[PDB]
């Protein structure tokens, strides 16, 4: 099963410097340039703080 | 980049050069111009804002791609809505886009929904042609997949990326058939890499591009033609030789066997024939299989190699790198990605992810199955369901 979907694995939240938000499996090495900001927890919970938190989408370059 | 700093090079160096066909109408670079700032101008004037979005309900024409343009001159981003959607998915696209202005012709009028503001583009308007301009980081579209629909929410700077591209190898004497759907984006080929490439626009005659019309088309100096992977594969199969005159042949979405490209080979030993892969939210193509005239494609048809500027990568369950003849996830990367899908901040987090190849990059995954060739090339193998 892809790691990203798979509904019972174990999930992070990653942010960058632009404030886009990543699904990521808390298995993997963080890619760098990326901030863990949530989890491990699972993937509707991580999908609930990105709804939750990422109110934006536009990248924080753009609006500053 | 932006497409409108693009277009705007060739406008300053061949100001009288065709840039729009259609039907006996015909648009040098400077008239597309001048008429998108006017409607420019009309759009500012309403106080049409830099993000606002502009939903487009018109006929495949002159106007049509007047209209796209004044768009991106006013600081705001196209909506393409194909006048042939029935009016529930119209209105969803509208509402769900944040639309608040759409531009209509007299014959598409009474489907711009109630509560939308109705822009007719051959009204005149006591308004001052302006531009507020294009701006890389700033939207450009919102293009709707076949899913529910998501809208998928492009920046200029991938939309250049895209046009904008040396590998589609676009000159000023090319004349490219436009007849597409605007909604999709093999629009961007159709429209915006002959304009920024100094060469012709030549708007389809209403209906369905048939292999007889193509023909017509070709005879008449149409140099380069995309068509949907079911059209391809059943002129490949019926017509072969419709394709004959043409400097390249472009096609991809759907599967297109090896098969159909070797019946057009056999019949036109000297088009170019060019494959190619990529989803909306990478912007219209990731990655391309390109035939030189005379070659023959061989049992297996490759989505081939990323355009310049973009990077692929096939990974396996725990997210490492496969050798080649593995079949791994794929993932796209470098220029062309969305910013993501409107108003679906956990679906944009579940598919534009964290790239481990470049710091602070996202790739998109594809959902879609591949494998590498011993060169470099990239083989389909299938959807990850
Ligand atoms: C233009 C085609 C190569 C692919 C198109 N982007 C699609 O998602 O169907
Ligand atoms: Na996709």
């Known amino acids: 099963t892809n790691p990203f979907d798979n509904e019972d694995g174990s999930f992070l939240v990653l942010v960058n410097g632009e404030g886009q938000h990543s699904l990521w499996p808390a298995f993997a090495e963080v890619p760098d340039g990326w901030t863990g900001v949530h989890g491990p927890a699972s993937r509707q919970d991580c999908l609930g703080y990105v709804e939750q938190n990422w109110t934006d989408l536009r990248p924080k370059s753009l609006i500053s | ?40 101008g009309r ?17 495949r024409s002159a106007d049509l791609v007047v209209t796209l343009l004044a768009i991106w001159k006013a600081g705001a981003a196209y ?41 007719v583009v051959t009204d005149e308007e006591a308004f001052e042609a302006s531009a507020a301009g294009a701006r890389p980081g700033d939207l450009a579209y919102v293009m709707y997949t076949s899913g529910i629909p998501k809208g998928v929410a492009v920046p200029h700077r991938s939309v250049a990326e895209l046009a904008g591209n040396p590998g589609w190898a676009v000159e000023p004497g090319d004349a490219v058939l436009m007849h597409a759907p605007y909604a999709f984006d093999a629009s961007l ?56 005159g043409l400097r390249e042949v472009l096609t991809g979405g759907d599967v297109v066997p090896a098969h159909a490209v ?30 030189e005239p005379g070659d023959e494609i061989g049992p297996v048809l ?30 796209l990367s470098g220029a062309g990605l969305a ?3 409107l108003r ?26 591949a494998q590498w060739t011993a060169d470099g090339a990239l083989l389909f193998a299938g959807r990850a369901d």
């Open chain 2, 262 to 291: 070797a019946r057009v080979r056999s019949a036109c030993p000297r088009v170019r024939i060019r494959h190619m892969y990529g989803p909306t939210e990478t912007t219209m193509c990731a990655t391309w299989h390109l035939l």
């Open chain 2, 339 to 341: 910013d993501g899908y």
């Open chain 2, 344 to 369: 679906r901040a956990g679906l944009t987090a579940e598919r534009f992810v964290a790239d481990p190849s470049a710091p602070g990059a996202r790739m998109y995954r594809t959902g879609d199955l």
């Open chain 2, 79 to 119: 909506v393409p809505v194909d006048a042939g959607y029935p009016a529930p998915r119209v209105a969803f696209m509208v509402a769900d886009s944040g639309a608040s202005r759409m531009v209509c012709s007299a014959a598409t009028r009474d489907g711009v929904p109630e509560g939308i503001e109705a822009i």
């Open chain 2, 302 to 331: 490759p989505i081939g190699r990323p355009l310049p500027g973009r990077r692929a990568q096939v990974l396996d369950a725990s997210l490492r790198a496969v050798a080649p003849g593995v079949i791994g996830d794929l993932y």
């Open chain 2, 1 to 40: 980049s932006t497409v409108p700093e693009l277009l705007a090079r060739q406008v300053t160096r061949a100001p009288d050069a065709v840039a729009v066909v259609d039907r006996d109408r015909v648009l040098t670079y400077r008239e597309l111009d001048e008429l998108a700032g006017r409607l420019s």
């Open chain 2, 43 to 59: 759009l500012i004037g309403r106080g049409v804002r830099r993000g606002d979005r502009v939903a487009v309900l018109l006929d």
């Open chain 2, 189 to 244: 080929f159709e429209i915006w890499v002959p304009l920024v490439s100094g060469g012709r626009v030549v708007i389809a005659e209403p209906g369905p591009v048939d292999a007889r019309r193509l023909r017509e088309a070709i005879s008449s100096g149409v140099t380069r033609a995309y068509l949907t992977a079911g059209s391809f594969r059943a002129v490949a199969e019926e017509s072969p030789e419709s394709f004959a």
